Design goal:
The structure is cut from a larger assembly and holds 6 copies of chain A (about 190 residues). Chain A has about 190 residues and is mainly alpha-helical. Chain A has helices at about 5-15, 20-45, 60-70, 75-105, 105-130, 155-189, and strands at about 50-55, 140, 150-155. In chain A, helix 4 (about 75-105) packs antiparallel against helix 5 and helix 5 packs antiparallel against helix 6 (about 155-189). The radius of gyration of chain A is 22 Å and the shape is elongated. Chains in contact: A-B, A-F, B-C, C-D, D-E, E-F. Chains A, B, C, D, E, F: This is Gap junction alpha-1 protein.
Amino acid sequence: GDWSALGKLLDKVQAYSTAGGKVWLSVLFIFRILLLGTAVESAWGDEQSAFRCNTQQPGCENVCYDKSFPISHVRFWVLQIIFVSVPTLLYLAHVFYVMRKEEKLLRTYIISILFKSIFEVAFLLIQWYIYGFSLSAVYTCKRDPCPHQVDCFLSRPTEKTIFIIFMLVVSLVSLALNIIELFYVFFKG
Amino acid sequence: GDWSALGKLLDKVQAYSTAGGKVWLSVLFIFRILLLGTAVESAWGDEQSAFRCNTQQPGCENVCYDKSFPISHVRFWVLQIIFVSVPTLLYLAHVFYVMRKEEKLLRTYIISILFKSIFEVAFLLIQWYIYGFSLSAVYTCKRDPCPHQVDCFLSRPTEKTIFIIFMLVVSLVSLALNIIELFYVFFKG
Amino acid sequence: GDWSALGKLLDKVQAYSTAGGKVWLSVLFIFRILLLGTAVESAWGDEQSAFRCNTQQPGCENVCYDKSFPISHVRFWVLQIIFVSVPTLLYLAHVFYVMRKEEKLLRTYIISILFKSIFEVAFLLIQWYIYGFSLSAVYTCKRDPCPHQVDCFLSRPTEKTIFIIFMLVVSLVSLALNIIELFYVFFKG
Amino acid sequence: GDWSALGKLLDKVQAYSTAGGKVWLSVLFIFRILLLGTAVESAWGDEQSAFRCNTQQPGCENVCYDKSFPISHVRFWVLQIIFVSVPTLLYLAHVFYVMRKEEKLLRTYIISILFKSIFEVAFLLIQWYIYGFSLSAVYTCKRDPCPHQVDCFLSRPTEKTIFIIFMLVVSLVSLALNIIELFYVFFKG
Amino acid sequence: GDWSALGKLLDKVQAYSTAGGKVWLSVLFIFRILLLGTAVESAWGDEQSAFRCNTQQPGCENVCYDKSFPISHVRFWVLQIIFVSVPTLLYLAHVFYVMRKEEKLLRTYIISILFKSIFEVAFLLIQWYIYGFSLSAVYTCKRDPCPHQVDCFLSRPTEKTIFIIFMLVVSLVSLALNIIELFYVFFKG
Amino acid sequence: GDWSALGKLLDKVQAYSTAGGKVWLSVLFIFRILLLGTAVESAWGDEQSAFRCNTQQPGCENVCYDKSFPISHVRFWVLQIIFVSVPTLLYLAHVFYVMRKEEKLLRTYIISILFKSIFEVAFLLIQWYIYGFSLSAVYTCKRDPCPHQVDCFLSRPTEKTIFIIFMLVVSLVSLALNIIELFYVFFKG
């Protein structure tokens, strides 16, 4: 029975955060995890199996899908959320070690928040560069195996576009909350 | 061993709710989650794989399925339940922070309930606009790849219609309970 | 460490039940859940994929399967068990609130038992009306896309019939136990 | 912290059992559950999908598989283990209620053991009648859709035969242990 | 809160084991379980589906796969690890009963270790007899349905061979540790 | 309630580690496990099913896939992480036994760290030898069943290349941290 230690650890890390920014950030994080784990994962299930091209050339479908999707959106979002979460976990464990020292910091919190913001904007920029924020039903593919130009058709482009916009909005809200947090720490300083 | 704290937290949030409205709302929520997680998820498993169109045009099936189902009903319902649940979690965590302040509100509960009602009615209206409340076995598809008009056939339209009506009834009951809750808070005020 | 509270809650709800009826009902419920979760779910896995019709008409298989199975037996049974379980959960939570009042009913138990009986008989009648209690290997399908009449063949009809009879027997036993419970409460009154 | 109550409940039920019969029976039960849950379930995964018949008749494969396998071996074994386990759970819960009476039997144990033996021998006899204890690679099918007689080929007959023999040996060992238990209770009486 | 009892039970069983043999055996067991549960299970996923034969004879692929693989390697390894684990569980539960007697053995440990060694060597010999320790890409199949001799091709033979060698090395290390354990008990005696 | 013992065990093992090296290593390990368990596993799902070759020769696809992928990257990475983790678990359990002795070492930590470094560099060298650090969309296959030379096409080569580079970077960071740890222990000595 050591429920008090976890409560004290939770209090210490939030002691340097805004009133209510912590709760909105945590709720938004669990919202994003729930959305990623159930809906978008099942939406992207048949990304290659339902992918089809109008050609008889063997191997054209493989290269055309590879060119159309350099990386799946779901795996990209998983990487983004992991990269966003890593600095927070680092800071939490560092504060845990600080408490262990106390039994026998603010600058690190600022660095973690700022790095999380950097990672979020970097992932957004990469998504804009590679894919944009929409998916087209018809993709024109010009790859070496395929003769001339071929037409290929994605799986559920519209629902994927909807989920892409949802994830973009979620990322933007998270970034805005992080900037507000940084501004509050600047105000305190 | 800190079972008392969770009980006190549960008591505090329900202190502003009707006698018995809380239990009906919670039971209905777990009912909806159980129905969504087991039955309707398996019902929508072959939505695109069993989807078929009477044509020889390559890529016509993809675009016709995309036009017929801009977003899957199951994923739409997952989004709806998440959006309905978010304000409740926000209020619960806010009350937790209020208790933390007490160790060392009603307006937020009203706002959360009202926003949950807004989200429920908005999702119902969106479902009515895009899909309606029934599914037809035969869908006439007129999309660019397909020549003229083609006939396509959905997977298990009748069982999906039954589950759609079930979810509509569940959403209506939840909205009615929320309005009764709001009326009770108005009566108290 | 609050094991005593759950024991007291368990005692209070069973205080109004017969000697031994509670244990048989609980064992039968867990039996039905185990049977539904493992065996019958896997038995119905290929209900549409292995479903086949003797025709060349595009879309005839879809409409014929839809007409043959308006709702899957497994999902129907899931709905039935959820509907049967809901009144019990309502009564348990109501008794929990009654204990909370005591810290600072029989009619509801009767109503819950009677409503559970009503739901059980209603689901049995619906199953009898739509399907009966057997499955035939060959189904004659007369639907609009299909020309004239077509012959279709179900997946594992015999094993499904066996499981249907098993579920019917389980439901009948549960209903009989519920009627015995109601008779005992009448005897007490 | 109520670890003592579960220990006392465990002691009370085993108080009427042989020295060491309890441990062998429990180990054998967990062995059977582990074998059923991992190996044989995956072995029977493609029972119908890999099932093939040498014919061009539509629907012949469905009826031939249905006739060859009235019920899957894995589901049959799941039913058998559930039926064997039910009397033990009934007796355990009855002893729990007896302890509740004590805070404020042997004949039932004998009945449960004997009924478990009956169920085991009944399931063995049913398996012998329907299937035997071996699987043949080639099955001759004479069903109405199929013209004359057709040849069908099972999926992995040899490995399935091996697992069938394993389950038969496990069931025989369990029955022998149950008979030894009954003989010991007779010796005590 | 009864953490002390499990620690005492752990101490009692290891009291008859070598210094460090216990930890190496436990680590090796968890290593084998982790390797079996994740890597080799996914490696053997398409053992029959990707299995192909150069023939037009219906049913030749089924019988050729059955003859090539009398039992899957993964299921064989699951059986082997279960058989190896059973004597250890028997001994642990026997020591638990011995402690229960104490509240109100070495020979069994020797027997369990020796039987575990016997089972390990028996499974290794069976694997050598049926399969050997390698898999060939091309299998020549001479079975009744197939005319003359046919050529069949396994799924991922090289990776399966690598995992087979890994499991062989793991089994050999476990057997060597068991023999060292037996020699130590002989030295003590 | 024995939370103190686990804390003491955690303190003892980290007592010989650098300030902050432990936390970075642990965070990196959980990062690698999360990346392997969700993203790369789903990325490699259709490695053989989507693998295609431009030939009519039966069995050419099987042998060409086998030659192209002697072992899957995901299973190789699972083996690598297991091999890296094993020495750490050995050291932790050894320290646990040392504490048990204390109730009634540095050289082992050095050996475990150095062996973990050896395993990491060995797996990196093996990956470089067999595969390199990139995947090509088109693979030229010259195997016995296939006539002359055939062209085969991998599934999602670009996304797999991205994940391969990610895993390479992760492994390099882990190795660098291990070398820094060894240098610190040398400095202490």
